[PDB]
DNA sequence: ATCGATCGATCGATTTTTTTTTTTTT
DNA sequence: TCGATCGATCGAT
C-alpha cells in the first residue's frame, strides 16, 4: 500500500536519521550490538519516538499486534540480510518497549482499557513452570497418506496434495514449530492498597522470548497489553456472563536489577577512569559513604568495605571459602545509626525485608509435602535463599526470640542450607552478606568496661562475627556545637561524588575484576595474631579466631579492589591492620592504650 | 553414548525437541515396575470384520505382548544458577532393561529426548542409550566395570603396609594436624560385621561418631568432605521423627513415600543434634540400634528397616 | 441493621451495581439503593412444561452510601482555592488576634476543668510538621508522640474518646478489644484462598490519622516491642506469612499509662515508678502528667460543672470561638510551605547547649528533632511561614517543663 | 421434467470426594 | 439414551 507501507519505511529512515548522544546513534549500533550476543530481545525508546514521529501515538491503539508485527519485519529484513549468516540460531525477532508516560495502578482498568496500549506493576505470586506450545497449522492426511501442508481459530481448507481430498487426517509429534509458554499471576503491592483489605488481581501471559525471568515474590514493571478471552460459554447465563480477563506481555522491567545492568552512554561510561587512579580518592568512599552525620567515619568506611567486596576462591574440591563478612555494631540506644543501614539498602544491588521478629526462622509455610492437593501447598525456608549474593538487614539482635537467631547461625561460614521434615529432603546455598545495628541490656551503654558482661550474644556466635565496631558517646561541648550545626543547616534545604555511580563502580567491581594475592610480608600477620592472643586470654579475648584473620587479606582486596589495582602492596594490609588494632582497642579497657604501647613500633 | 558435551535443564525448550541431547543432573526417586507392551491379537476403527455393529473389539490378551515401563527422575545441579531460585527438576521414561539401572540419589550423564504426549501441552523425556557420571566416579556405587586392572591395583595398594597412616593425611590437603581425630573418621566409612546367628540377635554392624567443641578447628568443613567422599546424604537441625504417610490425591490412599531410608549402604552425617528439640529425636533414638524402623500410624504395619550408620556434631555452651 | 427483628436468620439478598455505580461502595456501609427486582435467567420438583427451576435475584442501580462520607474542604470569597478557606472575612481575624493562643485553647474543652497545660499542648498532635522538599536522603517526619500517665479516672479518657470523634481519618480503639491482631491482620491458617492472608490489622488502619489507645501498660509485649520500632522508622515487617511484607505506619500517638500500685509516691524515680523496659521513654517528646490531690475547692468547682450539665436550659458555660471555624482554619493551616531563615534557627545551638548545661548536671538529640518540630508546629499556629524565635522560647519552656516534670 | 423441503434411518458421545497426618504458630 | 447427518422422497414449479 501507498500510507501503510511508510510505517516500516519511517522506522528505517528512524534509525538511522535520529541522533542523540552526540553522533553514532544508538539503534544505529544497538541491534548489532544485539546481534552479536544472540539475544533477539532489541527494545524501542518512546520518548525518543516522540523526539523523532510523534506520529506513532494515534496509528498504534486501533490494532497494536499489527504495529508490532510491521515492527518484527524491519528488525528481520534489517539484521537477517545485514547479517546472512544470521539465519542458523533461531530466526526471529521482537521488539519491546520501556518508556510509558503513565503508570496505572491495579483496581484501576475496565472495559475502556480494552486492547490497547497498557502500563502496570504489581508482584508475582504463586503460578505455573514452564511448558511449550504449539506454532504452526500441521497435519498428515490418513486416507491418501499425504500431510495436508502448511496452514485460536482453525484453517482445515479442501485443497491439500490428496486431490484436494481426505477431510480426516491425523498428526506428528515432529516437523511443526514450538514456543515456550508460562503463566504468572499479578498482585498488588501491600503498601499501595486500600489500607487494610483484600487485594486484586489479574492473570498475565508472557511468552517464549520472556521465560525464567519472574519469580515468586518479586517487584515488577510491565508495559502489557489488555486481553479478552472472547468466550466463557456464552449461554443461558448467570447474573453475568462468565467472562475473564488477562493481560498479554510485550516487555518487563524488573525493579531490582540483580545482574550487571545499565547501558552505556558514548563517553559518560569511562567516569571510572577519569579520576578512579588518583591517590586521595581512597578517602572519597566516605564523602559519598553517608553525608549524614557529623562524626562516625571509621564504621562507615568499615561498612563501605564490606558492601565492596566478593570473592569464592574455590580450592579444587574442598569447599566454597567465603566472600561476604559479618558485621554489627551493638553500641547504645541513642546514636544515629538505624539511618546508617537505610543507604545500603537504597543503594546495593540485591537486599530484603525484615526486622527483629520475623519467624521462629522456621519461616513462613517452609516444610509443605509435595501434592496438587490444597493448590501447590508453597515452600520455602526464610529468606537468605531469597537474596543470596545480596544482603540481610536486621536490626535488634538482642530482641528476638533466641530460638530463630539459633537457626541463622549457620550461613555466615558455610553459606548453606540443609533441610528435612517432610517427604523431601532438597537442599540449597545461602551465600549472602549480614548486617546488623542493634541495642545491648542495662539501657545505654557501659564505660570501656568489658563485651561479654555488657550483652547476652554467647561465644560460639560472636567468632563466626568477625568486624566489630562500637557508637560510644560521652560529653563534649564543643562537638555538640558542631553537629549541632551541622543538623540545623541539614533542615536548610528549602526551596563530591553523587549516588548515581557508586552503584555503578561496586557493580564494576564486584562482578568483572576478580583479584588474588601474592608472597609480600605474611610471615607478619603470624606475629600480630600471635600478639593478639597472647595479650588477650581472658579479659574480652573469646573473639579471637581465624576468620577475623582470613577477613584481613581479604579486607586487603577489598582495598585493592577498591582501587581496582588487581593485586596489592604493604599499604592496604597495613590499612587494615590498622583499623583492627584500633576497633579492638575501641572494645577494651579505659586503660585503652595497651595495644597502644605495644603497636606504636608498626605504626 | 558419547562424549560431547553436557548441558543444563534450563536450555530444554521448544526448538530441542524430539532431538537428541546430553545432560547431567541428579535424582530424587522414581516409579515402580507396572507394564507396556507391543502389539496384541489406538484408534481402532468402526467396521465389524446380520450385523455386528460398531466397534465390538475383544483383546485377545494371551495373543498379546510385554515390556518393562519405570519412569526414571531428574533434578539438576547445584552451580547452575540456583542462587535466586530453588532447583526445578523432571520425570522421565524408560523402556525394556535399564529398570535398577539408576536408584535415586546419583550422578548422571544422560543421553535422551524431549517430546510430548498430546496449544498448552505437556513435557517429558526418555532415555536414547543412558550413560553415567565420573565425578571422580560418579556413578561407581552398585555395579562393576571396574577390571582385573582395578583389582590389580586395589590388592597392591591392600597388602603395603604404609596405606593407614597414608590414609590418616588423605582428606585434608589443606588443614594442618588433629590426626588423632582423624585415625577413625575413615574406618566409621568402612564398617564391620552384620551377623545374624539362629536366635535373634541381628547385632549392631556399623558404627557412628561424636563430636563436640568450640568453634575454630574446622568442623564444617570436615564433614562436608565426608559427605564428599560412597553414598550420603546431609541435614544439620530442623528435621523427621514423623516419617511419610501422605496421599496421592490421586485414587486417596495412604501410600508411603518413606530418608534414613536413603542410607542403607551409604552413610548420614549430622551437625546440632543439640539445637533441635525433642520431638524429633526418638524415631532416631531407635533406629541406630536395631534398624528396624517400624510404623503402626493407620491400618499397616510394614515394619521396615534400614541399614545406616550416623555422624554428630554439636556445639556446647559457654 | 436498621431493621432488626427477631426469630429467623440474616436472610441474604443478591444485589449488583453498574459502572459508575462499582468501587464507591465499600465493606462497613448502609445504603439506600432502587428496588429493581428482576426474573432471573435441583428440589424444585414441581411440574415441568414446554410449548426449569428458578431462584430469586435483584439488581438495583442507585446508591446513596451515606454515614462513610466527610469531605474534605472545598464566607463564598476569594481564595487559593475554591472553598479551602473562602472564610479569609473571618480567618484574617483568627490569624492575628493576639489572646488566640489562649482563645483556642478554651475553646475545645468547656465541659472540662482540670490542667491548663495539655489543653494548649494537646493541639500539638492535630497540628503540622515540616512537608519540606529536600532529596532522597531519607524520610523527614512531621508528627509525634504524646503520653498521659495520671491518678484513676481523672478524666484520663474523655480527652480521647471525643478527640477520635474530633478529627477524621482518625479513628481510636484498644487492641485488647481483639487478639494480637492490632498490629498484624487475623493470622489464618486454614484454606479459603491460598491459606495465609495477613495483609492488615487495626494500627496501621489509621494511616495520616491517629489511633490511639488505653490500659498502655497491661499490653503484651509482642505489639509494644514492635512499637519500638514502629514509631520512628515507620516501616513494619514480620515473617511467617508474609510475601515479604513491606507495610507502612506514618502516624502519631497518644499514650494512656497508669502507675504500678495505683498512686504517685515519691519514693522512687519516674523510671522506677513505672518500673519498665526503658528507651522507649525518649522518643514520647512530652508527658504532662495528670496528679490528683485532695482539696474540696476543686471538686466543688467539677460538681458545679455538672451543676451546668444537667439543668437542661443553658447547661454550659458561654465561648468565644466555635469549632467549626476553629477545625477549618486548622485545616488551612498546613499547606504552607513553611520557611526558616532567622536568627534563632541561627542561634539554637546554644538553646540546646544551654538544655545540655542543664542536662550537665537521659539525654540527646532524638529531643532536640521534637524541639524544632514542636514550635515549627507554634508557627504554623501563626499562620505564617518564616519561622520566628519566640516559638522557639516557647518550645524550650515546654521541653523544660516535661523534664523537670520527670525530675525528682 | 428440475428442484427444495421434510421424514426418517444412521451415525457417534456421555456417566470419580470426605479424613487424615504432618505442620506452624498461638 | 440423546443429538445432528445424510440420504431419500413428494409437491411445486
Ligand atoms: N548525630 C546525628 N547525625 C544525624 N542524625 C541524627 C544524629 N543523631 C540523631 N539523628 C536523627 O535522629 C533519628 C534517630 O535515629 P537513630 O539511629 O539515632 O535512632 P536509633 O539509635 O537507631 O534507635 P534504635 O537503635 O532504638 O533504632 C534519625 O532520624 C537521625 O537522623
Ligand atoms: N585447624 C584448622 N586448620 C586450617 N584451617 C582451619 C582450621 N580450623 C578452621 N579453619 C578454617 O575455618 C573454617 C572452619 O570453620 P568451621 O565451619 O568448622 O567452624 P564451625 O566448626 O562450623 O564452628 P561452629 O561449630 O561454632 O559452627 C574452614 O573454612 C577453614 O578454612
Ligand atoms: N476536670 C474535669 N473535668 C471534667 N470531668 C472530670 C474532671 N475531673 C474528673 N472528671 C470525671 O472523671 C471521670 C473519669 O472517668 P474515666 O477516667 O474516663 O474512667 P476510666 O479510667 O475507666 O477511663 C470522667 O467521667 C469525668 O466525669
Same mark, same amino acid.
Given at each position: 500500500?501507498?500510507?501503510?507501507?511508510?510505517?516500516?519505511?519511517?522506522?528505517?529512515?528512524?534509525?538511522?536519521?535520529?541522533?542523540?548522544?552526540?553522533?553514532?546513534?544508538?539503534?544505529?549500533?544497538?541491534?548489532?550490538?544485539?546481534?552479536?550476543?544472540?539475544?533477539?530481545?532489541?527494545?524501542?525508546?518512546?520518548?525518543?519516538?516522540?523526539?523523532?514521529?510523534?506520529?506513532?501515538?494515534?496509528?498504534?491503539?486501533?490494532? %497494536?499486534?499489527?504495529?508490532?508485527?510491521?515492527? +518484527?519485519? #524491519?528488525?528481520?529484513?534489517? =539484521? @537477517?540480510?545485514? *547479517?546472512? !549468516?544470521?539465519?542458523?540460531?533461531?530466526?526471529?525477532?521482537?521488539?519491546?518497549?520501556?518508556?510509558?508516560?503513565?503508570?496505572?495502578?491495579?483496581?484501576?482498568?475496565?472495559?475502556?482499557?480494552?486492547?490497547?496500549?497498557?502500563?502496570?506493576?504489581?508482584?508475582?505470586?504463586?503460578?505455573?513452570?514452564?511448558? %511449550?506450545?504449539?506454532?504452526?497449522?500441521?497435519? +498428515?492426511? #490418513?486416507?491418501?497418506?499425504? =500431510? @495436508?501442508?502448511? *496452514?485460536? !481459530?482453525?484453517?482445515?481448507?479442501?485443497?491439500?496434495?490428496?486431490?484436494?481430498?481426505?477431510?480426516?487426517?491425523?498428526?506428528?509429534?515432529?516437523?511443526?514449530?514450538?514456543?515456550?509458554?508460562?503463566?504468572?499471576?499479578?498482585?498488588?503491592?501491600?503498601?499501595?492498597?486500600?489500607?487494610?483489605?483484600?487485594?486484586?488481581?489479574?492473570?498475565?501471559?508472557?511468552?517464549?522470548?520472556?521465560?525464567?525471568?519472574?519469580?515468586?515474590?518479586?517487584?515488577?514493571?510491565?508495559?502489557?497489553?489488555?486481553?479478552?478471552?472472547?468466550?466463557?460459554?456464552?449461554?443461558?447465563?448467570?447474573?453475568?456472563?462468565?467472562?475473564?480477563?488477562?493481560?498479554?506481555?510485550?516487555?518487563?522491567?524488573?525493579?531490582?536489577?540483580?545482574?550487571?545492568?545499565?547501558?552505556?552512554?558514548?563517553?559518560?561510561?569511562?567516569?571510572?577512569?577519569?579520576?578512579?587512579?588518583?591517590?586521595?580518592?581512597?578517602?572519597?568512599?566516605?564523602?559519598?559513604?553517608?553525608?549524614?552525620?557529623?562524626?562516625?567515619?571509621?564504621?562507615?568506611?568499615?561498612?563501605?568495605?564490606?558492601?565492596?567486596?566478593?570473592?569464592?576462591?574455590?580450592?579444587?574440591?574442598?569447599?566454597?571459602?567465603?566472600?561476604?563478612?559479618?558485621?554489627?555494631?551493638?553500641?547504645?540506644?541513642?546514636?544515629?545509626?538505624?539511618?546508617?543501614?537505610?543507604?545500603?539498602?537504597?543503594?546495593?544491588?540485591?537486599?530484603?525485608?525484615?526486622?527483629?521478629?520475623?519467624?521462629?526462622?522456621?519461616?513462613?509455610?517452609?516444610?509443605?509435602?509435595?501434592?496438587?492437593?490444597?493448590?501447590?501447598?508453597?515452600?520455602?525456608?526464610?529468606?537468605?535463599?531469597?537474596?543470596?549474593?545480596?544482603?540481610?538487614?536486621?536490626?535488634?539482635?538482642?530482641?528476638?526470640?533466641?530460638?530463630?537467631?539459633?537457626?541463622?547461625?549457620?550461613?555466615?561460614?558455610?553459606?548453606?542450607?540443609?533441610?528435612?521434615?517432610?517427604?523431601?529432603?532438597?537442599?540449597?546455598?545461602?551465600?549472602?552478606?549480614?548486617?546488623?545495628?542493634?541495642?545491648?541490656?542495662?539501657?545505654?551503654?557501659?564505660?570501656?568496661?568489658?563485651?561479654?558482661?555488657?550483652?547476652?550474644?554467647?561465644?560460639?556466635?560472636?567468632?563466626?562475627?568477625?568486624?566489630?565496631?562500637?557508637?560510644?558517646?560521652?560529653?563534649?561541648?564543643?562537638?555538640?556545637?558542631?553537629?549541632?550545626?551541622?543538623?540545623?543547616?541539614?533542615?536548610?534545604?528549602?526551596?563530591?561524588?553523587?549516588?548515581?555511580?557508586?552503584?555503578?563502580?561496586?557493580?564494576?567491581?564486584?562482578?568483572?575484576?576478580?583479584?588474588?594475592?601474592?608472597?609480600?610480608?605474611?610471615?607478619?600477620?603470624?606475629?600480630?595474631?600471635?600478639?593478639?592472643?597472647?595479650?588477650?586470654?581472658?579479659?574480652?579475648?573469646?573473639?579471637?579466631?581465624?576468620?577475623?584473620?582470613?577477613?584481613?587479606?581479604?579486607?586487603?582486596?577489598?582495598?585493592?579492589?577498591?582501587?581496582?589495582?588487581?593485586?596489592?602492596?604493604?599499604?592496604?594490609?597495613?590499612?587494615?591492620?590498622?583499623?583492627?588494632?584500633?576497633?579492638?582497642?575501641?572494645?577494651?579497657?579505659?586503660?585503652?592504650?595497651?595495644?597502644?604501647?605495644?603497636?606504636?613500633?608498626?605504626? | 553414548?558419547?562424549?560431547?558435551?553436557?548441558?543444563?535443564?534450563?536450555?530444554?525448550?521448544?526448538?530441542?525437541?524430539?532431538?537428541?541431547?546430553?545432560?547431567?543432573?541428579?535424582?530424587?526417586?522414581?516409579?515402580?515396575?507396572?507394564?507396556?507392551?507391543?502389539?496384541?491379537?489406538?484408534?481402532?476403527?468402526?467396521?465389524?470384520?446380520?450385523?455386528?455393529?460398531?466397534?465390538?473389539?475383544?483383546?485377545?490378551?494371551?495373543?498379546?505382548?510385554?515390556?518393562?515401563?519405570?519412569?526414571?527422575?531428574?533434578?539438576?545441579?547445584?552451580?547452575?544458577?540456583?542462587?535466586?531460585?530453588?532447583?526445578?527438576?523432571?520425570?522421565?521414561?524408560?523402556?525394556?532393561?535399564?529398570?535398577?539401572?539408576?536408584?535415586?540419589?546419583?550422578?548422571?550423564?544422560?543421553?535422551?529426548?524431549?517430546?510430548?504426549?498430546?496449544?498448552?501441552?505437556?513435557?517429558?523425556?526418555?532415555?536414547?542409550?543412558?550413560?553415567?557420571?565420573?565425578?571422580?566416579?560418579?556413578?561407581?556405587?552398585?555395579?562393576?566395570?571396574?577390571?582385573?586392572?582395578?583389582?590389580?591395583?586395589?590388592?597392591?595398594?591392600?597388602?603395603?603396609?604404609?596405606?593407614?597412616?597414608?590414609?590418616?593425611?588423605?582428606?585434608?590437603?589443606?588443614?594442618?594436624?588433629?590426626?588423632?581425630?582423624?585415625?577413625?573418621?575413615?574406618?566409621?566409612?568402612?564398617?564391620?560385621?552384620?551377623?545374624?546367628?539362629?536366635?535373634?540377635?541381628?547385632?549392631?554392624?556399623?558404627?557412628?561418631?561424636?563430636?563436640?567443641?568450640?568453634?575454630?578447628?574446622?568442623?564444617?568443613?570436615?564433614?562436608?568432605?565426608?559427605?564428599?567422599?560412597?553414598?550420603?546424604?546431609?541435614?544439620?537441625?530442623?528435621?523427621?521423627?514423623?516419617?511419610?504417610?501422605?496421599?496421592?490425591?490421586?485414587?486417596?490412599?495412604?501410600?508411603?513415600?518413606?530418608?534414613?531410608?536413603?542410607?542403607?549402604?551409604?552413610?548420614?552425617?549430622?551437625?546440632?543434634?543439640?539445637?533441635?528439640?525433642?520431638?524429633?529425636?526418638?524415631?532416631?533414638?531407635?533406629?541406630?540400634?536395631?534398624?528396624?524402623?517400624?510404623?503402626?500410624?493407620?491400618?499397616?504395619?510394614?515394619?521396615?528397616?534400614?541399614?545406616?550408620?550416623?555422624?554428630?556434631?554439636?556445639?556446647?555452651?559457654? | 441493621?436498621?431493621?432488626?427483628?427477631?426469630?429467623?436468620?440474616?436472610?441474604?439478598?443478591?444485589?449488583?451495581?453498574?459502572?459508575?455505580?462499582?468501587?464507591?461502595?465499600?465493606?462497613?456501609?448502609?445504603?439506600?439503593?432502587?428496588?429493581?427486582?428482576?426474573?432471573?435467567?435441583?428440589?424444585?420438583?414441581?411440574?415441568?412444561?414446554?410449548?426449569?427451576?428458578?431462584?430469586?435475584?435483584?439488581?438495583?442501580?442507585?446508591?446513596?452510601?451515606?454515614?462513610?462520607?466527610?469531605?474534605?474542604?472545598?464566607?463564598?470569597?476569594?481564595?487559593?482555592?475554591?472553598?479551602?478557606?473562602?472564610?479569609?472575612?473571618?480567618?484574617?481575624?483568627?490569624?492575628?488576634?493576639?489572646?488566640?493562643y489562649?482563645?483556642?485553647?478554651?475553646?475545645?474543652?468547656?465541659?472540662?476543668?482540670?490542667?491548663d497545660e495539655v489543653?494548649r499542648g494537646?493541639?500539638l498532635?492535630?497540628?503540622?510538621?515540616?512537608?519540606?522538599?529536600?532529596?532522597?536522603?531519607?524520610?523527614?517526619?512531621?508528627?509525634?508522640?504524646?503520653?498521659?500517665?495520671?491518678?484513676?479516672?481523672?478524666?484520663?479518657?474523655?480527652?480521647?474518646?471525643?478527640?477520635?470523634?474530633?478529627?477524621?481519618?482518625?479513628?481510636?480503639?484498644?487492641?485488647?478489644?481483639?487478639?494480637?491482631?492490632?498490629?498484624?491482620?487475623?493470622?489464618?491458617?486454614?484454606?479459603?484462598?491460598?491459606?495465609?492472608?495477613?495483609?492488615?490489622?487495626?494500627?496501621?488502619?489509621?494511616?495520616?490519622?491517629?489511633?490511639?489507645?488505653?490500659?498502655?501498660?497491661?499490653?503484651?509485649?509482642?505489639?509494644?516491642?514492635?512499637?519500638?520500632?514502629?514509631?520512628?522508622?515507620?516501616?513494619?515487617?514480620?515473617?511467617?506469612?508474609?510475601?515479604?511484607?513491606?507495610?507502612?505506619?506514618?502516624?502519631?500517638?497518644?499514650?494512656?499509662?497508669?502507675?504500678?500500685?495505683?498512686?504517685?509516691?515519691?519514693?522512687?524515680?519516674?523510671?522506677?515508678?513505672?518500673?519498665?523496659?526503658?528507651?522507649?521513654?525518649?522518643?514520647?517528646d512530652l508527658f504532662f502528667?495528670?496528679?490528683?490531690?485532695?482539696?474540696?475547692?476543686?471538686?466543688?468547682?467539677?460538681?458545679?460543672?455538672?451543676?451546668?450539665?444537667?439543668?437542661?436550659?443553658?447547661?454550659?458555660?458561654?465561648?468565644?470561638?466555635?469549632?467549626?471555624?476553629?477545625?477549618?482554619?486548622?485545616?488551612?493551616?498546613?499547606?504552607?510551605?513553611?520557611?526558616?531563615?532567622?536568627?534563632a534557627?541561627?542561634?539554637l545551638?546554644?538553646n540546646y547547649?544551654h538544655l545540655?548545661?542543664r542536662?550537665?548536671?537521659?539525654?540527646?538529640?532524638?529531643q532536640?528533632?521534637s524541639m524544632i518540630?514542636l514550635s515549627?508546629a507554634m508557627?504554623?499556629?501563626?499562620?505564617?511561614?518564616?519561622?520566628?524565635e519566640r516559638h522557639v522560647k516557647e518550645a524550650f519552656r515546654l521541653l523544660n517543663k516535661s523534664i523537670i516534670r520527670?525530675?525528682?
Open positions: 500500500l501507498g500510507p501503510r507501507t511508510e510505517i516500516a519505511n519511517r522506522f528505517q529512515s528512524f534509525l538511522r536519521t535520529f541522533v542523540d548522544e552526540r553522533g553514532a546513534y544508538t539503534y544505529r549500533d544497538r541491534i548489532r550490538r544485539m546481534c552479536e550476543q544472540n539475544m533477539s530481545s532489541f527494545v524501542v525508546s518512546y520518548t525518543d519516538l516522540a523526539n523523532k514521529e510523534h506520529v506513532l501515538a494515534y496509528f498504534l491503539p486501533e490494532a %497494536p499486534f499489527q504495529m508490532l508485527e510491521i515492527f +518484527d519485519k #524491519v528488525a528481520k529484513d534489517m =539484521v @537477517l540480510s545485514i *547479517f546472512p !549468516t544470521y539465519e542458523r540460531v533461531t530466526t526471529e525477532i521482537h521488539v519491546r518497549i520501556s518508556e510509558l508516560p503513565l503508570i496505572e495502578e491495579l483496581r484501576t482498568f475496565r472495559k475502556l482499557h480494552l486492547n490497547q496500549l497498557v502500563r502496570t506493576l504489581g508482584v508475582v505470586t504463586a503460578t505455573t513452570g514452564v511448558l %511449550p506450545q504449539l506454532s504452526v497449522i500441521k497435519y +498428515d492426511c #490418513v486416507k491418501c497418506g499425504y =500431510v @495436508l501442508g502448511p *496452514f485460536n !481459530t482453525e484453517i482445515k481448507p479442501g485443497s491439500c496434495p490428496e486431490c484436494q481430498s481426505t477431510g480426516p487426517f491425523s498428526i506428528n509429534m515432529e516437523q511443526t514449530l514450538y514456543r515456550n509458554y508460562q503463566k504468572i499471576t499479578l498482585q498488588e503491592s501491600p503498601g499501595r492498597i486500600p489500607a487494610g483489605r483484600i487485594p486484586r488481581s489479574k492473570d498475565v501471559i508472557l511468552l517464549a522470548d520472556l521465560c525464567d525471568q519472574c519469580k515468586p515474590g518479586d517487584e515488577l514493571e510491565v508495559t502489557g497489553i489488555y486481553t479478552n478471552n472472547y468466550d466463557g460459554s456464552l449461554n443461558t447465563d448467570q447474573g453475568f456472563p462468565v467472562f475473564a480477563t488477562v493481560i498479554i506481555a510485550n516487555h518487563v522491567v524488573v525493579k531490582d536489577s540483580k545482574q550487571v545492568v545499565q547501558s552505556l552512554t558514548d563517553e559518560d561510561i569511562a567516569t571510572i577512569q577519569k579520576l578512579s587512579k588518583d591517590p586521595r580518592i581512597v578517602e572519597r568512599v566516605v564523602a559519598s559513604m553517608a553525608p549524614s552525620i557529623y562524626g562516625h567515619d571509621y564504621i562507615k568506611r568499615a561498612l563501605a568495605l564490606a558492601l565492596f567486596g566478593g570473592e569464592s576462591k574455590n580450592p579444587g574440591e574442598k569447599h566454597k571459602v567465603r566472600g561476604d563478612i559479618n558485621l554489627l555494631i551493638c553500641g547504645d540506644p541513642g546514636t544515629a545509626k538505624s539511618q546508617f543501614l537505610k543507604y545500603t539498602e537504597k543503594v546495593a544491588p540485591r537486599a530484603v525485608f525484615t526486622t527483629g521478629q520475623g519467624a521462629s526462622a522456621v519461616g513462613l509455610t517452609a516444610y509443605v509435602r509435595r501434592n496438587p492437593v490444597s493448590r501447590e501447598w508453597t515452600l520455602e525456608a526464610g529468606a537468605l535463599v531469597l537474596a543470596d549474593q545480596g544482603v540481610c538487614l536486621i536490626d535488634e539482635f538482642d530482641k528476638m526470640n533466641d530460638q530463630d537467631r539459633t537457626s541463622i547461625h549457620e550461613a555466615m561460614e558455610q553459606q548453606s542450607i540443609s533441610i528435612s521434615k517432610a517427604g523431601i529432603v532438597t537442599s540449597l546455598q545461602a551465600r549472602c552478606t549480614v548486617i546488623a545495628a542493634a541495642n545491648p541490656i542495662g539501657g545505654r551503654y557501659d564505660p570501656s568496661m568489658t563485651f561479654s558482661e555488657n550483652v547476652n550474644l554467647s561465644e560460639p556466635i560472636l567468632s563466626r562475627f568477625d568486624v566489630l565496631c562500637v557508637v560510644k558517646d560521652e560529653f563534649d561541648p564543643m562537638q555538640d556545637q558542631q553537629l549541632a550545626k551541622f543538623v540545623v543547616h541539614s533542615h536548610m534545604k528549602h526551596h563530591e561524588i553523587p549516588q548515581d555511580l557508586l552503584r555503578q563502580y561496586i557493580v564494576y567491581a564486584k562482578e568483572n575484576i576478580r583479584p588474588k594475592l601474592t608472597n609480600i610480608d605474611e610471615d607478619k600477620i603470624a606475629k600480630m595474631y600471635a600478639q593478639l592472643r597472647q595479650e588477650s586470654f581472658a579479659t574480652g579475648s573469646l573473639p579471637i579466631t581465624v576468620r577475623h584473620i582470613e577477613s584481613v587479606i581479604r579486607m586487603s582486596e577489598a582495598h585493592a579492589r577498591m582501587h581496582l589495582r588487581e593485586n596489592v602492596m604493604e599499604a592496604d594490609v597495613s590499612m587494615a591492620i590498622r583499623m583492627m588494632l584500633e576497633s579492638f582497642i575501641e572494645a577494651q579497657k579505659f586503660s585503652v592504650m595497651k595495644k597502644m604501647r605495644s603497636t606504636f613500633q608498626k605504626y | 553414548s558419547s562424549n560431547a558435551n553436557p548441558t543444563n535443564i534450563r536450555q530444554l525448550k521448544s526448538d530441542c525437541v524430539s532431538k537428541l541431547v546430553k545432560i547431567a543432573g541428579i535424582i530424587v526417586a522414581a516409579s515402580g515396575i507396572s507394564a507396556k507392551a507391543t502389539r496384541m491379537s489406538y484408534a481402532l476403527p468402526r467396521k465389524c470384520n446380520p450385523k455386528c455393529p460398531l466397534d465390538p473389539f475383544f483383546i485377545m490378551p494371551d495373543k498379546c505382548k510385554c515390556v518393562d515401563f519405570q519412569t526414571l527422575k531428574l533434578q539438576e545441579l547445584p552451580d547452575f544458577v540456583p542462587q535466586g531460585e530453588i532447583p526445578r527438576h523432571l520425570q522421565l521414561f524408560c523402556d525394556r532393561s535399564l529398570c535398577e539401572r539408576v536408584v535415586p540419589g546419583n550422578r548422571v550423564l544422560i543421553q535422551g529426548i524431549y517430546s510430548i504426549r498430546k496449544g498448552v501441552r505437556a513435557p517429558y523425556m526418555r532415555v536414547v542409550g543412558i550413560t553415567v557420571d565420573s565425578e571422580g566416579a560418579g556413578a561407581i556405587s552398585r555395579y562393576s566395570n571396574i577390571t582385573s586392572d582395578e583389582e590389580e591395583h586395589f590388592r597392591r595398594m591392600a597388602a603395603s603396609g604404609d596405606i593407614y597412616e597414608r590414609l590418616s593425611q588423605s582428606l585434608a590437603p589443606s588443614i594442618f594436624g588433629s590426626r588423632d581425630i582423624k585415625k577413625a573418621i575413615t574406618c566409621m566409612l568402612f564398617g564391620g560385621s552384620r551377623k545374624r546367628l539362629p536366635d535373634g540377635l541381628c547385632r549392631r554392624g556399623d558404627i557412628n561418631v561424636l563430636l563436640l567443641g568450640d568453634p575454630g578447628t574446622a568442623k564444617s568443613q570436615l564433614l562436608k568432605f565426608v559427605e564428599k567422599v560412597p553414598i550420603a546424604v546431609y541435614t544439620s537441625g530442623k528435621g523427621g521423627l514423623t516419617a511419610s504417610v501422605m496421599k496421592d490425591p490421586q485414587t486417596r490412599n495412604f501410600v508411603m513415600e518413606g530418608a534414613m531410608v536413603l542410607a542403607d549402604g551409604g552413610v548420614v552425617c549430622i551437625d546440632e543434634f543439640d539445637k533441635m528439640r525433642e520431638d524429633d529425636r526418638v524415631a532416631i533414638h531407635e533406629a541406630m540400634e536395631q534398624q528396624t524402623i517400624s510404623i503402626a500410624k493407620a491400618g499397616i504395619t510394614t515394619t521396615l528397616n534400614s541399614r545406616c550408620s550416623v555422624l554428630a556434631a554439636a556445639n556446647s555452651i559457654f | 441493621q436498621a431493621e432488626l427483628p427477631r426469630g429467623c436468620i440474616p436472610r441474604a439478598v443478591e444485589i449488583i451495581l453498574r459502572s459508575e455505580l462499582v468501587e464507591t461502595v465499600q465493606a462497613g456501609d448502609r445504603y439506600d439503593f432502587t428496588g429493581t427486582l428482576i426474573v432471573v435467567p435441583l428440589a424444585g420438583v414441581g411440574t415441568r412444561a414446554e410449548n426449569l427451576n428458578y431462584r430469586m435475584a435483584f439488581l438495583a442501580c442507585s446508591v446513596q452510601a451515606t454515614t462513610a462520607r466527610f469531605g474534605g474542604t472545598d464566607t463564598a470569597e476569594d481564595m487559593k482555592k475554591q472553598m479551602t478557606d473562602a472564610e479569609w472575612h473571618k480567618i484574617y481575624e483568627m490569624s492575628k488576634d493576639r489572646n488566640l489562649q482563645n483556642l485553647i478554651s475553646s475545645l474543652f468547656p465541659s472540662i476543668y482540670g490542667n489543653k494537646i493541639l498532635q492535630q497540628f503540622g510538621g515540616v512537608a519540606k522538599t529536600t532529596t532522597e536522603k531519607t524520610s523527614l517526619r512531621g508528627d509525634i508522640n504524646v503520653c498521659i500517665v495520671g491518678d484513676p479516672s481523672t478524666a484520663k479518657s474523655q480527652f480521647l474518646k471525643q478527640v477520635s470523634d474530633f478529627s477524621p481519618r482518625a479513628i481510636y480503639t484498644s487492641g485488647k478489644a481483639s487478639s494480637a491482631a492490632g498490629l498484624t491482620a487475623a493470622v489464618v491458617r486454614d484454606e479459603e484462598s491460598f491459606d495465609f492472608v495477613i495483609e492488615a490489622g487495626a494500627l496501621m488502619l489509621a494511616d495520616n490519622g491517629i489511633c490511639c489507645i488505653d490500659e498502655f501498660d497491661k499490653m503484651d509485649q509482642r505489639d509494644q516491642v514492635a512499637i519500638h520500632e514502629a514509631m520512628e522508622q515507620q516501616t513494619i515487617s514480620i515473617a511467617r506469612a508474609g510475601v515479604r511484607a513491606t507495610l507502612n505506619a506514618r502516624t502519631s500517638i497518644l499514650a494512656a499509662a497508669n502507675p504500678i500500685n495505683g498512686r504517685y509516691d515519691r519514693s522512687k524515680s519516674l523510671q522506677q515508678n513505672i518500673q519498665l523496659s526503658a528507651p522507649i521513654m525518649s522518643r514520647f502528667i495528670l496528679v490528683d490531690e485532695c482539696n474540696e475547692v476543686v471538686d466543688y468547682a467539677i460538681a458545679r460543672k455538672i451543676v451546668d450539665l444537667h439543668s437542661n436550659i443553658e447547661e454550659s458555660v458561654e465561648r468565644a470561638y466555635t469549632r467549626e471555624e476553629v477545625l477549618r482554619y486548622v485545616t488551612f493551616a498546613r499547606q504552607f510551605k513553611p520557611v526558616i531563615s532567622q536568627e534557627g541561627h542561634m545551638v546554644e547547649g545540655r548545661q542536662d550537665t548536671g537521659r539525654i540527646t538529640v532524638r532536640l528533632e518540630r515549627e508557627a504554623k499556629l501563626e499562620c505564617s511561614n518564616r519561622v520566628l520527670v525530675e525528682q
